[PDB]
Paper text:
In the PT-based defense system Ssp, SspABCD confers a single-stranded PT modification of host DNA in the 5′-CPSCA-3′ motif and SspE impedes phage propagation. Notably, SspABCD coupled with SspE confers resistance to a wide array of phages through unusual mechanisms: (1) SspE is a dual-function protein that exerts both N-terminal NTPase and C-terminal DNA nicking nuclease activities to defend against phage infection, and (2) NTPase activity, including GTPase, CTPase, and UTPase activity, is stimulated exclusively by 5′-CPSCA-3′-containing DNA in vitro. Here, structural and biochemical analyses reveal that SspE is preferentially recruited to PT sites mediated by the joint action of its N-terminal domain (NTD) hydrophobic cavity and C-terminal domain (CTD) DNA binding region. PT recognition enlarges the GTP-binding pocket, thereby increasing GTP hydrolysis activity, which subsequently triggers a conformational switch of SspE from a closed to an open state.
The full-length SspE structure revealed a smaller NTD (residues 1 to 324) and a larger CTD (residues 332 to 771), which were connected by a short linker of only seven residues T325TGQPLT331. The NTD of SspE exhibited a DUF262-fold with the strongly conserved D96GQQR100 signature motif, which was essential for GTP hydrolysis and was positioned at the junction of the α3 helix and the β4 strand. The CTD of SspE contains a DUF1524 domain that belongs to the His-Asn-His (HNH, the last histidine of which can be replaced by an asparagine, as observed in SspE) nuclease superfamily and indeed exerts DNA nickase activity in vitro. In contrast to the typical HNH motif in Cas9, GVE2, ScoMcrA16, ColE7, or BrxU18 that consists of two antiparallel β-sheets and an α-helix, the HNH motif in the CTD of SspE from S. yokosukanensis DSM 40224 was composed of two antiparallel β-sheets and a loop, suggesting comparatively higher flexibility. However, the active sites of the HNH motif in SspE still adopt a characteristic ββα-metal topology, in which the first histidine typically acts as the general base in the DNA cleavage reaction, asparagine is involved in structural stabilization and the third residue, which can be either histidine or asparagine, is responsible for metal binding. Indeed, single-point substitution of N676 in the HNH motif by an alanine or the elimination of divalent metal cations, i.e., Mg2+, markedly impaired the DNA nicking activity of SspE in vitro. One unique hydrophobic patch that was also lined with positively charged residues, e.g., R32, was located on the surface of the N-terminal region of the SspE structure. SspE displayed an extended dumbbell-like shape, with a short loop linking its two globular NTD and CTD domains. The NTD and CTD packed loosely against each other, with few contacts between them.
Residue numbers in the entry:
A (entry chain A), B (entry chain D): 1 to 771
C (entry chain C): 1 to 221
The structure:
């Protein structure tokens, strides 16, 4: 008694784990039911998909799936409703991890359904098509004996795996066999489905309780069934169309597969028939099935769970405990520092370039992290992704091994120094960018042009608030050249950077103004960072090369525009067309602020149409100034027509047949002081009056109209907020106090039209428009 | 490539892990330096000491210590400054666990020190003495080759384990060998001390840097050296004197050891010679050493860590990642539910006694737990420790295996059912007690006697605030009888319960008033729960028996009283002597609230001496009513002489010779309105004025003295908080407005003495005092 | 129960096999005495030397020595005259192979003798020479803790490995520890000579029976 077995860990691929010929996986009776919300599931599938995608590159890369701790129950003392007559030969009651295992078996069930049914749609007279049909049969059977097992006689001839105590008893006989737990029932039913002769229709699923089985929640069944069916949807979509939304699950493509020898060997122990790398090089109807199968094989033979087997249950619980207490992992920077300590040059580093860069990055990390441990990792991810765009042009993930591996890769391309310490200079500079223009945007750079300073400054303060980090790459790329330049070209730099900032915010405003979402834009900037620019001179996001150089000032503008063509559209007519019909408040509130502030650039109330606005005062009160973003003068996005009229305070239901009406430009302005807290709002009249309050050009109308509105009750909440003698000029609220008639739906349409047009005119000079 | 090594897991006793003959433990260069604060170290030692204590019971209980994940560096690619000539043959660079491992090596160093020097004090002419001296030699050597290792020639002929990269190079040659990290240096130097002939003094230690080695923080050395010497002090105290503070580290005593066969086999492969168990039964100069030796051998051979070995570093990182994702363990209650499902009777439970109890306990858990996952286990602990009092009379520990084991033990004593399902009825009642008089005390039970209701109600609200849960056993024990009673003896029960509550508040008030701490009280309440009371009639804390019956109503009082003798002291004289000299504001503030509210029970300002108080108005305004605990009339503890007078607001330093003065009753009362937030305090005059303010028996003293004090300034902070026209009667504050002279230390003694006298008078009737 | 241990095999260098820090090798009481005529010994050395010579060429060339089958006697039921007080912590009763094992232990004893006494002939002042002396110390010790093991106190503080039942009781105490079987006594006596300070004379060897130990044959000795 010292190691007297105690515990017993070994690694297994999920195929060698699940499909062991005589085993039953058994959920002990104190486990909760299936929890795992769909984000945990998506992380799961995306993990294995990532490891697969990275397998083409690194031929030995193994993907991990955690631990399962189980009791090897040898006298079947834990199968609480059992028929010893024929319990399986090795039961492994799952002490911990049963959530993963449930997810896993389900994953196989959907991989099985998809690969089967797409494979019957195959033309078996095409040589590569039959190759694919055969490969499919292979993986189909190999998953089939992964989730269920052919015990050899009786009705209920097939045993699931996973089972739960109480509901579900393993047996192969005609009475006495139940499969009634969520996973128990699910696997029983799918299994019988697969064995349908003359099947080949996709899987329905007939969810349980024909009149019984209230041993669980019925909500549990709902959850498990839904979770499975969404695994099926995720995968279906991961090979299908091209809408390719930002997360989804990216596994390599037909061309990817066909041209990766190592992927072929490590998943099919053989090199592909050349007829097939041909058929795959260009989708050709069979590439989705083949991609699903490659994913299948990677799942089976290259994803591994760590299996810990205890022989006594009490040891097993103490094991679980000892494994829930296992340290505090290290950010990819910490684990990467050794690899530059060991190139600079030896261990004599302290006053040797890289030390300074690392002093920078570590300083920033200790500052903004510190507070916790995964705060420290999310800060590290924050400074690492812009860098990945910057130094390379690749989308870095938030997963540790990737960050570690990418830093290792990039650092080990140009194997010098002066060459490598430029790579580290990259990270240093992204940190430095976070310290200047993003902390408080007013630093920006120096430069004169003092309208440029606060214009690019509003660009920054808006790009911070509301997502659009994708940009931190490029802009750091340029903030770099301003601080790396011959003492003369300080001004040249400062200008390129400032203009770049403006144009990025502009393109932001247009892309998210027109579409309803950040659809491609992340990918578009990625493509920008890699695309060839001007024959052989630079490459957009510094790429080896030399950090100081590259690209110009303005190849941004021409490329972003040339893109605004394509599936972007850039004629003010086409663009304001898209943007007048997109609910901007639903999207990012800082975008709608940018749009209102750009639409009311030195603007004035319109006399021809009561409530619109127009331009023409070159510099009346110019709003695209960073000082007028923060301007808590007018800094509340107020809806004219409210979002909530639950019993209808009155209003016009023309505005609510389409629930997006209430959230377009034409329904909002920037109102000072109160939001919905001090003194605010009501129905279209009290709203008229409130706007009439703040728009008067004399105090002998200010107090007059304060009193005008106090009759119906403008002093709402107590006695009207900071509402006694406010000056201030708000062109949109002035020309909104000037409309009587009523608040029509047509009028919000025309208003959002007019507002978008003004903004477009105000901004598109920021991309330097002529395309 | 499928399990292609990847990883490789094995359990080893810390002896077989550390003292393997060719191994080097190597801390790679991205590890933090030695972190672990003393709470963690003390937890560690307690874990192993617990394992020992529980090995005495269960001869098989193995104690776990978690995981260390290490890279078997096979070509020494991570020994970052190296002399390959004699790198040790097997280095294991530690990815995770270097904190535990560092602690462990330090621990061996301290046990080696203690056992060394304590065995030199042995009279080696005595047969059990020579056994102990040898046994000491045995573990002494097995620890020695546990922390260092004998490479065989040269200066620096001895290698550490644990070494840190960058600083520290293993080698045996005369230049060229460094051990300069915190752990490296510690191990090197301690080893030299151990190998000193003609030594035998305890280890001093000469911390590092004779003028160098500033690659580190100089604080790291401080922290590590300190943690070592306090491991040493911790043990020294756990086997030495008798002060036995609340934590300490509980390891068995000579007798414990001497009479437990299984402990002797499992640590010494053999039964002790009886001469030794005899000399052990009563310390006799050799028992501390033996206790320490038993502890060290348990450390060496029965603490076992799981060692996970990877062959590539990045595999090790991904593993570490995969073992940080390891479920969320379950409360001892969840893992015990099955074992009562399978006694009721079989699986046809749903309408079966035990189901009801569990539904109750589960409801209460899901209600108050829920919010987190370890909050759920902390809720379960809150209901489990008192249940341990109630159904048995044992101190349950807050550790999981202990809770599970106790539940299995108790549930399976009287192995019928009805005996068992009564045991479960126990848990249900603890939860319901937590739902009745502890949530809001105001429910209490029913009954008339309506003074008992708010009197036991203040008893409860007082026992809840300010620790003293030790009672929850008893009272639940009683609350049961009120809900389980022949409908006639409902009133008898309700009364018993209320009186139990009062008596406990009394014994509390006295015990923490007179003594300085919860010194014995815990043992006292447990003692009552186990003692035989009246031969064969019952037993105080339900012990099987039958839930409704048992004990009386008032044997509580007699027993608690008989105990108030001994080391309790209860002659009003003795008690006031003790309690006048205990700073009660220092201990539990609710205790001082209880003592002041009992000291002003229908009390009146004293005229004979200006500022004390006297009783006698039987029902003037009686304060021991739960409606007056919360009565934020008088619910602020005001110090007369302030704790803060750093430059002397003026005041009297007679009160500051002894810092316990400022915090005795004689310096505190119950003040309405302000503490130190609205309008408050100053120097003793303004304090006079504030006490004169709220004591006014007319409004024409209210406004008069309000403005009196605004002259010096009672409106401090704004304009005197809720201070205009207050009725309100606070007898204590009147006789505080009634002392002129000055605020002396002598008078504070007098004041606390009288207040204590009064409270003693007011409360001891709650124990129905005759002893 | 299908492979439920049944058996359990693994390879070990003669170093990691013999010198396990807590092990005792025990010849059960039905084994024949030491037989092996000098030719089997000659093949033993010639094989190990051949593997050695073939290592210069192939850096992976590993040399085998056969199999030993042992029972991991866990509650000391085959140690036939025992002091449980301090039987070694892990005994392995050798079901097959005790002839190799006896040869081996003897071999380690002779290599230890030669390397020791030749190294004391070293002029420890010549740089390669001190290289050699140290190397001697390293191998010398790693053979010492190969044939015996330092249990830590008492007279007869050192245990042989290999011991034969009936004759020979492992213990570290002053009565009660016997080593009178042929190997037992040889290893014990070699061990004592190893630890003689100020020896450094080659080994003589003073064989048994000052008047006793005819529990065996005397020819085996």
């Amino acid at each position: 008694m010292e190691t007297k077995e105690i515990f017993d860990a070994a690694p297994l691929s999920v195929s060698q784990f699940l499909s062991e010929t005589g085993q039953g996986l058994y959920i002990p009776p104190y486990q909760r039911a299936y929890s795992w919300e769909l984000p945990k599931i998506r992380r799961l599938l995306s993990d294995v998909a990532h490891g697969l995608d990275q397998l083409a590159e690194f031929e030995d890369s193994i993907c991990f799936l955690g631990t399962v701790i189980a009791l090897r129950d040898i006298n079947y003392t834990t199968v609480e409703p059992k028929y010893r007559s024929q319990v399986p030969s090795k039961v492994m009651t799952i002490i911990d991890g049963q959530q993963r295992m449930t997810t896993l078996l389900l994953l196989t069930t959907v991989l099985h359904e998809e690969i089967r049914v797409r494979a019957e749609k195959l033309t078996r007279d095409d040589e590569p098509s039959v190759w694919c049909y055969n490969q499919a049969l292979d993986v189909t059977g190999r998953l089939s004996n992964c989730f269920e097992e052919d015990m050899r006689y009786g009705e209920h001839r097939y045993y699931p795996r996973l089972i739960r105590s109480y509901y579900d008893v393993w047996s192969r006989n005609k009475g006495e066999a139940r499969y009634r737990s969520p996973i128990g029932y699910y696997l029983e039913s799918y299994g019988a489905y697969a064995r349908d002769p003359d099947a080949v229709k996709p899987y329905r699923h007939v969810p349980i309780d024909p009149d019984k089985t209230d041993g669980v929640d019925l909500e549990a069944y709902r959850h498990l069934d839904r979770m499975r069916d969404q695994m099926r949807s995720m995968l279906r979509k991961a090979v299908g169309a091209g809408v390719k939304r930002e997360d989804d699950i990216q596994l390599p493509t037909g061309t990817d597969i066909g041209q990766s020898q190592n992927l072929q060997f490590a998943l099919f122990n053989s090199e592909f028939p050349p007829s097939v790398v041909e058929q795959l090089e260009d989708d050709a109807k069979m590439t989705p099935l083949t991609r699903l199968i490659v994913f299948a094989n990677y799942l089976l033979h290259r994803v591994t769970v760590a299996v810990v087997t205890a022989k006594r249950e009490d040891y097993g619980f103490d094991m679980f405990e000892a494994l829930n207490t296992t340290g505090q992992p290290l950010t990819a920077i910490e684990t990467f520092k050794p690899r530059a300590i060991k190139e600079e040059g030896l261990d004599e580093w302290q006053e040797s370039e890289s030390k300074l860069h690392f002093d920078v990055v570590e300083a920033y990390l200790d500052r903004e992290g510190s507070s916790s441990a995964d705060k420290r990792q999310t800060v590290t991810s924050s400074v690492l992704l812009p860098f990945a765009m910057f130094q390379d042009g690749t989308k870095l993930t938030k997963r540790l091994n990737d960050q570690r591996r990418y830093l290792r890769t990039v650092f080990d391309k140009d194997p010098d120094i002066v060459a490598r310490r430029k790579v580290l200079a990259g990270l240093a500079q992204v940190a430095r960018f976070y310290e200047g223009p993003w902390g408080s945007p007013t630093k920006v750079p120096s430069c004169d042009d003092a309208t440029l300073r606060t214009q690019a400054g509003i660009a920054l303060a808006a790009l911070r608030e509301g997502g659009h980090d994708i940009v931190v790459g490029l802009l750091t790329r340029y903030f770099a050249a301003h601080r790396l330049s011959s003492p003369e070209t300080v001004e040249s730099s400062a200008r390129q950077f400032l203009l770049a900032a403006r144009s990025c915010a502009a393109f932001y405003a247009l892309w998210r103004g027109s579409f309803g979402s950040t659809a491609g834009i992340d990918g578009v900037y990625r493509s920008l960072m890699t695309h060839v620019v001007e024959e052989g001179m630079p490459r957009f996001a510094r790429f080896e090369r030399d950090l100081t150089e590259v690209p110009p000032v303005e190849a941004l503008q021409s490329y972003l525009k040339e893109q605004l063509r394509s599936e972007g559209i850039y004629d003010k007519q086409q663009w304001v067309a898209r943007a007048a019909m997109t609910p901007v408040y639903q999207h990012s509130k800082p975008l709608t602020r940018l749009l209102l502030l750009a639409a009311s650039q030195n603007s004035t109330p319109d006399s021809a149409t009561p409530g619109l606005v127009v331009r023409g005062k070159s510099g009346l009160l110019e709003t695209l100034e960073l000082e007028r973003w923060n301007d808590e003068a007018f800094a509340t996005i107020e809806h004219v027509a409210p979002q909530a009229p639950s019993s209808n305070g009155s209003w016009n239901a023309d505005l609510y047949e389409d629930p997006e009406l209430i959230n377009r430009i034409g329904n909002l302005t920037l109102l000072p002081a109160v939001e919905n807290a001090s003194a605010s709002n009501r129905a279209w009249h009290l709203k008229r009056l409130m706007f009439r309050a703040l728009s008067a050009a004399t105090v002998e109308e200010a107090e007059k109209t304060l009193a005008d509105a106090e009759a119906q009750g403008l002093r709402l909440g107590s006695g009207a907020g900071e509402i006694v003698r406010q000056a201030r000029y708000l062109p949109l609220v002035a020309a909104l106090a000037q409309r009587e008639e009523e608040w029509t739906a047509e009028f919000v349409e025309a208003r959002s039209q007019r507002l978008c047009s003004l903004a477009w005119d105000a901004l598109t000079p920021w991309l330097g428009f002529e395309p």
